[PDB]
Amino acid sequence: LDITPCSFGGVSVITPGTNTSNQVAVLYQGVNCTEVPNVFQTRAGCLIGAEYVNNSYECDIPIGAGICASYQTSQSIIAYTMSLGAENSVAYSNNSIAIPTNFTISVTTEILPVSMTKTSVDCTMYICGDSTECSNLLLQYGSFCTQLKRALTGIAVEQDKNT
């Protein structure tokens, strides 16, 4: 007889912040909602706790396979497809042109990280909690944490090199 395992999958919670509201949306990922026991079936899984609409807007919380979600308005969680922007085509001919007559000067910020927090972990105090019986069998493992001390120094010599 064909042995199939019964229906299982991941459970994710789609929710806004606690200072805004408290409603959730349970997503049974990989599970159809005919086999689970105001509902909508997606490709990633059937969604419980969201009102599906036909219009598409700019969303914030992604779900999967094009379906996205946001908290809008007497307020509940809605779900729709991900909008790819406003459609505005440009005309074309063989003898016309479009010349700009004005401009604008804007400042756009760009943030790139360079360095990080240099740490250093010793083998005597982290492994042994001020223990003398721990240190005698620490020498039997050879040179594990001597190589981790060279790796943590090799990270920290690159951090002031990056500056």
């Binding site: 042109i97 700009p100 760009e110 790139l112 990280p113 360079v114 721990c134 069998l137 944490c145 990056n162």
Partner: protein, 176 residues
């Protein structure tokens, strides 16, 4: 093991029996340190490639004008001003973005006397009445002269040429 405190292992069990619980605390804490330093060295590699991207942004956007598109900001890059930040550099990118436009008519060349006149700088534009020369990023109409154009071939081989005259500035200067 039975406990996490290493003093509770040694002071309660036999020293042949406490040692097998000790190495579970030794190899358990060394494996948590080994997944920390491999996640550290993976994070040290992506923080090097972003700092090398920031050093490329310090060399091209700050020390000069880079001709790249969408590297020193969205649009035509003019200048950049870096600012200090904890664990990174925040760049203020000044860009050139056109806002308002207007539609016109165009032609690639001008047939003056049987020969084709190609534009040297700018493109040929028209407002419906006369034909002018302006650039591609801003509107500034100029009259079509021989200094702004250059002759290349006849009018029978190019596609889209219209008939117009070219103002030669040496011709009114002989009687003036």
């Amino acid at each position: 093991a039975i406990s996490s405190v290493l003093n509770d292992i040694f002071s309660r069990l036999d020293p042949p029996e406490a040692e097998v619980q000790i190495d579970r605390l030794i190899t358990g804490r060394l494996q948590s340190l080994q997944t920390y330093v491999t996640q550290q060295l993976i994070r040290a590699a992506e923080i090097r490639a972003s700092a090398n991207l920031a050093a490329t942004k310090m060399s091209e956007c700050v020390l000069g004008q880079s001709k790249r598109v969408d590297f020193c900001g969205k649009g035509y890059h003019l200048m950049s001003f870096p600012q200090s930040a904890p664990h990174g550099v925040v760049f203020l990118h000044v860009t050139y973005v056109p806002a308002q436009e207007k539609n016109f008519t165009t032609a690639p060349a001008i047939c003056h006397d049987g020969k084709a006149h190609f534009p040297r700088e700018g493109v040929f534009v028209s407002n419906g009445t006369h034909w002018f020369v302006t650039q591609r990023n801003f509107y500034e109409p100029q009259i079509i002269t021989t200094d702004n154009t250059f002759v290349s071939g006849n009018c029978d081989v190019v596609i889209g040429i219209v008939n117009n005259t070219v103002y030669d500035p040496l011709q009114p200067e002989l009687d003036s």
